[PDB]
Design a protein around this nucleic acid. Structure first.
Lengths: 79, 49, 219, 49, 50, 225, 221
RNA sequence: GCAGAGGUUCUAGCUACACCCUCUAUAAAAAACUAAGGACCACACGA
């Protein structure tokens, strides 16, 4: 659980990009099969996405990197 | 608050009265002039009466 | 009729060895407070425990004075004595002699061992000395009294901190049981001087309160 | 969904601890009827009481 | 008149008692008013508005 | 009664129809929780064919705001009453005075913020001694309409219902007087030609005190009717 | 630390009686006082009625004929029936009053075990010699306050509220008793006010027992 | 399980938001189950 978001917004400092990136990350962690790269403590996907952000691990460009890595791994097994 | 730089989460009426009763002075009160070894000792003194 | 839910030290998440936070399982409503307040009164009121009660400064004789070299006012070399957590066994009115010269602070480790008298905070800086020639000394008389007692109630007299605990605060809050409406989760967050462990402080306070109940103890 | 509806309509004890599980980090929008400023609708982590 | 009626009963004239706390069991400083106000109960219940 | 009133609450409690006033002085010949029989005194007697004056009280009856219009006899068997006297304390009345609410010990102090802004902090002692419990009388109308190919009939012959549904109902589709019904429970049959049973709206609970079965001429009353 | 011990149970009345402990160490006075008062007011085994069965009354809002009081406030009177049991944990008490006259609690057809302590507690006023109330009053044990709803069946059963709270008013008053030669032994008194169903000595005994048992949560024996 | 019908129950049950199995013109060995729902004005007010 967590209370505030300042430690999260400070590195995504638009306070709106935070919502979008953590939302897509929580999507990939909830509807996708991705496991949280930050330890889970009986916490929903939203606070898990925030924690993954605050640890300097999940950001917009990191999410794009993960997306294109998945794309490359998908198209590598299709050839 | 977006209206002004004054914070909107402000202790409204009862907590502020309690704080005023706390943070005040009367020139004669039980155990005045004592020297304290930190705020924790002040809490220990007050809760012991 | 008499079945009452009892917790077992459910959360003892001690932060440091001088500050723990005991949080019990839900207790029947009206009992979180009746236990927190009881233990608070026991702990802030009376336990066996040694602390400084008075001191005779060698050179200084009045309560309001100052000696050179010791930039700390004598009133402050008295507060640091109140902070001087000391534990003794068997002996009660033991007198401790402090004697050190030279530039620098006077740590609590400078007090001579004086038999079985132990100090739990050796690096407690009482006062600082700025001169090699200045030889500060005193006879700090610690005592294993029971419970806090200031100097106004009763050579320089200092307030006593006979209670090993320094801060008692219980913030009882609602808990839940599968059907029971509202049971209270007591949360004792408590510090100590360091002489006695916080968990041990709670255990000894409970022991004292129960021993004051043995006459009407049944089953 | 019929079985789940029956279970939640009977509000078994297995439903309450599941509910407190699903409201772990789920904010709800409290709202006053005559809202004027945007501070008139905030969110909180609701605690089951 | 109300003061004299209070003093007829074995009650303080000032109208304030020293309410000991129910939990701490310690005296409330600044003795507090205690009396029998005629409290109504309005029709606007909650179980018809929950 | 209000521990501090205005003296005119008695007037506002007697002028209203809530309290059955003694229009004829005399001695209470027979009092009861439902009726009060007044033996008229000789002075107030009508010339001939005189006798008693039965103040038939109105027991729990639904108000307009769904409160209990209840009357309590405040006299006993053998206590004289006079002209303009008060006999039955109606709703929110006590011995002829007006007692809207109740009165209890009140102390003005901030008690750990539970009475933060304007909120009251009532003790469990109030609920324990049943001090502020209020009866609320709800009404559940149900009609039987002239539906084509057989009208609406109120029968316990409900389909797709277990014995739990027929438990509170009688052998003719109407709940017994005094069943601890709860949310969703059935009260009235109302089988429509092809199941439109009047059921307890969700949330509302409590006993059922009285069922009234109106009927226009042209249809025979069923067993409960 | 001198331990407290019961020294006086002065029975100023049957409804209430003060219990005094001769020795108590400085500070422990108000400690034990508040603990005992709280644990007495909150949790003490009561005996208040739980279920009544009028003879010819279906729901609690009906009005039997002959009784000068409607059934609802008959129940309201009953929920404060000062009764105590000795051998059972639940009992059903039968009442059969006939003829004009208030139905005092003494009219309850009691047994050798269940004995009422206020035989003048009026239940209802019968106003007809041809009318007769008949109640199968169910009396249970328990503690605290339990409403009618929050207890998890025939028509005749009238689920009355439960008031298992023998004590009504507890008030401790520390004093100063000069025991032996040591001062500051604050004598403690307990101006408790029961409803006549619990011995003040036994009340303090059980309250201390439960305080110790719950205090044994974090201590050995 | 996406176009229909049948099955052990209970008239009818083919994903209708909807619950199990079969196949493309044929009906039964089988327990947990079922219904997609309702507008406009006056008044007492309450924040």
């Amino acid at each position: 659980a967590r209370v505030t978001v300042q430690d999260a917004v400070e590195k995504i400092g638009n306070r709106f990009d935070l919502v979008l990136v953590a939302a897509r990350r929580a999507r990939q962690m909830q509807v996708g099969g991705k496991d949280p790269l930050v330890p889970e403590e009986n916490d929903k996907t939203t606070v898990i996405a925030l924690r993954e952000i605050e640890e300097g691990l999940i950001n917009n460009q990191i999410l794009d990197v993960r997306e294109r890595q998945e794309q490359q791994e998908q198209e590598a097994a299709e050839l | 608050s977006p209206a002004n730089g004054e914070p909107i989460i402000v202790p409204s009426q009862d907590v502020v009265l309690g704080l005023y009763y706390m943070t005040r002075d009367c020139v004669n009160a039980k155990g005045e002039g004592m020297v304290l070894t930190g705020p924790k000792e002040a809490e220990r003194l007050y809760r012991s009466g | 009729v008499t079945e009452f839910l009892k917790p077992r030290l459910v959360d003892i998440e001690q932060v440091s060895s001088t500050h723990a936070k005991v949080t019990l399982e839900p207790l029947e409503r009206g009992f979180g407070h009746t236990l927190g307040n009881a233990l608070r009164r026991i702990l802030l009121s009376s336990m066996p425990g040694c602390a400084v009660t008075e001191v005779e400064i060698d050179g200084v004789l009045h309560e309001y004075s100052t000696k050179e070299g010791v930039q700390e006012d004598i009133l402050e070399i008295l507060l640091n004595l109140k902070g001087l957590a000391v534990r003794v066994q068997g002996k009660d009115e033991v007198i401790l002699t402090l004697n050190k010269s030279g530039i620098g602070p006077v740590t609590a480790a400078d007090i001579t061992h004086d038999g079985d008298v132990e100090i739990v905070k050796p690096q407690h800086v009482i006062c600082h000395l700025t001169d090699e020639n200045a030889s500060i000394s005193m006879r700090i008389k610690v005592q294993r009294g029971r419970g806090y007692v200031p100097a106004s109630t009763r050579r320089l007299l200092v307030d006593a901190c006979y209670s090993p605990v320094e801060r008692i605060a219980y913030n009882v809050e609602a808990a839940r049981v599968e059907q029971r409406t509202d049971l209270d989760k007591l949360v004792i967050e408590m510090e100590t001087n360091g002489t006695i462990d916080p968990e041990e402080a709670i255990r000894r306070a409970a022991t004292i309160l129960a021993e004051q109940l043995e006459a009407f103890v049944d089953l | 969904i019929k079985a789940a509806k029956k279970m939640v309509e009977r509000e078994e004890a297995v439903v309450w601890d599941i509910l407190d599980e699903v409201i772990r980090e789920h904010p709800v929008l409290l709202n006053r009827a005559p809202t004027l400023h945007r501070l008139g609708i905030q969110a909180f982590e609701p605690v089951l009481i | 008149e109300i003061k004299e009626l209070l003093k007829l009963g074995d009650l303080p004239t000032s109208g304030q008692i020293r309410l000991y706390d129910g939990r701490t069991g310690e005296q409330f400083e600044r003795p507090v008013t205690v009396g029998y106000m005629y409290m109504l109960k309005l029709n606007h219940l909650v179980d018809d508005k929950m | 009664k209000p521990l501090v009133g205005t003296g005119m609450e008695r007037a506002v409690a007697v002028d209203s129809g809530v309290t059955a006033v003694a229009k004829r002085g005399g001695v209470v010949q027979y009092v009861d929780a439902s009726r009060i029989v007044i033996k008229v005194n000789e002075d107030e007697m009508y010339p001939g064919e005189a006798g008693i004056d039965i103040y038939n009280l109105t027991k729990y009856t639904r108000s307009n705001q769904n409160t209990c219009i209840n009357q309590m006899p405040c006299v006993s068997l053998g206590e004289p009453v006079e002209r303009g006297d008060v006999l039955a304390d109606g709703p929110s009345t006590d011995l002829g005075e007006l007692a809207l609410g109740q009165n209890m010990r009140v102390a003005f102090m901030p008690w750990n913020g539970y009475n933060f802004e304007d909120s009251i902090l009532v003790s469990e002692r109030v609920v324990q001694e049943d001090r502020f419990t209020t009866i609320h009388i709800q009404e559940l109308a149900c009609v039987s309409r002239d539906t084509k190919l057989g009208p609406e009939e109120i029968t316990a012959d409900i389909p797709n219902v277990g014995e739990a549904a027929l438990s509170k109902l009688d052998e003719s589709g109407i709940v017994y007087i005094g069943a601890e019904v709860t949310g969703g429970d059935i009260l009235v049959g109302k089988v429509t030609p092809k199941d439109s049973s009047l059921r307890v709206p969700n949330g509302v609970s409590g006993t059922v005190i009285d069922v009234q079965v109106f009927t226009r001429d042209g249809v025979e009353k069923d067993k409960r009717a």
